[PDB]
Design a protein around this ligand. Structure first.
Ligand SMILES: OC[C@H]1O[C@H](O[C@H]2O[C@H](CO)[C@@H](O)[C@H](O)[C@H]2O)[C@H](O)[C@@H](O)[C@@H]1O
Ligand SMILES: *[C@@H](O)[C@H](CCCCC)[C@H](O)CCCCC
Ligand SMILES: [Cl-]
Ligand SMILES: [Cl-]
Ligand SMILES: [Cl-]
Ligand SMILES: [Cl-]
Length: 327
């Protein structure tokens, strides 16, 4: 990319990267065993965020030295944030897949129910002050890309809640990202229905969308509406997809009365989630097509599980990334 970390960081106090977890860590994260069993190129790093006063864990797939400096992909988890079991590391072969591609991949393992944005208000249930856009865009790239010896190219990818984030970041900082991948989300956030979809994610973290982006339709909410500001994506290589499934983000790939009742619910909820995302994606495509902004589209049918589609999204988005990075 032509825009450097220092170009977007400006005044911002930068992150400090450590190769070891804080000594005050009480218990080992669930994902640590997965890192420890993967190739030596998969590393656990920790980035201190000055704005949040938080140590953020990162699962990093490092490139080999056979071709020198390589690009970096910032891959975001959904609502889980990497703080539970419903994430890239624990539900997909993300580590093995990218190891073979020879590319740097950085997966933050904190940020549950945050939309990876800068929140207007604090929320103790989510760690207090949330400044994930400042962290991911301004605090982290400079020191981390230096440590990884990247070639100066970068991409942002997100799924579900962070499939809004991966469209907002390149719009907020045009030219910073070479590519952006949005894996099954809703670009719109200020319209009636899209605002209510923010509540599905935020209710799980004891939060409201007003704490995050202020009043619906307000200045900051519109700034964070990726459908309204879709034209600002021009210049970025894009990959937009669908992870339509019955068993969603919560599900990994007793009596027959309760086994059939619970199964009836996933078909219904997965169906409402699929329908909601399908329209959001259709509106974005119509808006980008009308503006002459090209994207790689992976609109898929209803699958058995959403995580099966999300693992397939790592493959699908590789065509966008290989093209944007000239690999
Ligand atoms: O779709 C908009 C509404 O989404 C949430 O509520 C729905 O989902 C809950 C959990 O499955 C149900 O209990 C509830 O009946 C649904 O309406 C959100 O909590 C609402 O505020 C939104 O209007
Ligand atoms: C992620 O696809 C999804 C929210 C997408 C926005 C369109 C509805 C999430 O799984 C659904 C809510 C489950 C609780 C986190
Ligand atoms: Cl250290
Ligand atoms: Cl901490
Ligand atoms: Cl494969
Ligand atoms: Cl609070």
């Amino acid at each position: 990319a032509e825009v450097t970390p220092a170009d977007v960081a400006g005044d911002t106090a930068l992150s400090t990267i450590s190769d070891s977890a804080p000594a005050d860590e009480a218990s080992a994260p669930r994902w640590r065993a997965h890192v420890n069993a993967a190739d030596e190129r998969v590393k656990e790093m920790w980035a201190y965020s000055p704005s949040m006063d938080r140590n953020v864990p990162l699962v990093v797939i490092t490139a080999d030295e056979s071709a020198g400096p390589r690009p970096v992909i910032y891959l975001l988890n959904g609502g889980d944030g990497g703080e539970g079991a419903a994430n890239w590391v624990m539900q997909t072969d993300v580590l093995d897949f990218y190891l073979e591609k020879n590319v740097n991949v950085v997966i933050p393992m904190e940020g549950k129910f945050s939309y990876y944005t800068d929140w207007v208000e604090e929320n103790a249930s989510l760690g207090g002050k949330q400044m994930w856009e400042t962290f991911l865009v301004k605090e982290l790239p400079g020191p981390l890309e230096e440590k990884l010896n990247t070639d100066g190219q970068r991409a942002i990818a997100g799924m579900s809640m962070s499939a809004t984030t991966s469209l907002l970041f390149p719009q907020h900082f045009p030219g910073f990202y070479d590519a952006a991948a949005s894996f099954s989300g809703c670009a719109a956030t200020s319209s009636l229905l899209p605002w209510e979809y923010l509540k599905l994610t935020l209710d799980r973290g004891n939060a409201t969308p007003e704490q995050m982006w202020g009043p619906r339709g307000g200045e900051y909410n519109i700034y964070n509406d990726a459908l309204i500001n879709s034209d600002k994506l021009r210049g970025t290589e894009l990959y937009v997809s669908n992870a339509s499934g019955l068993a969603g983000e919560w599900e990994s790939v007793l009596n027959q009365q309760v086994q059939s009742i619970a199964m009836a619910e996933t078909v219904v909820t997965g169906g409402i989630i699929e329908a909601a995302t399908n329209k959001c994606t259709h509106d974005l495509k119509a808006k980008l097509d009308s503006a002459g902004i090209p994207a790689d589209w992976n609109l898929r049918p209803t699958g058995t599980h959403s995580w099966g589609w999300w693992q397939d999204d790592l493959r699908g988005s590789w065509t966008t990334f290989a093209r944007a990075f000239e690999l």
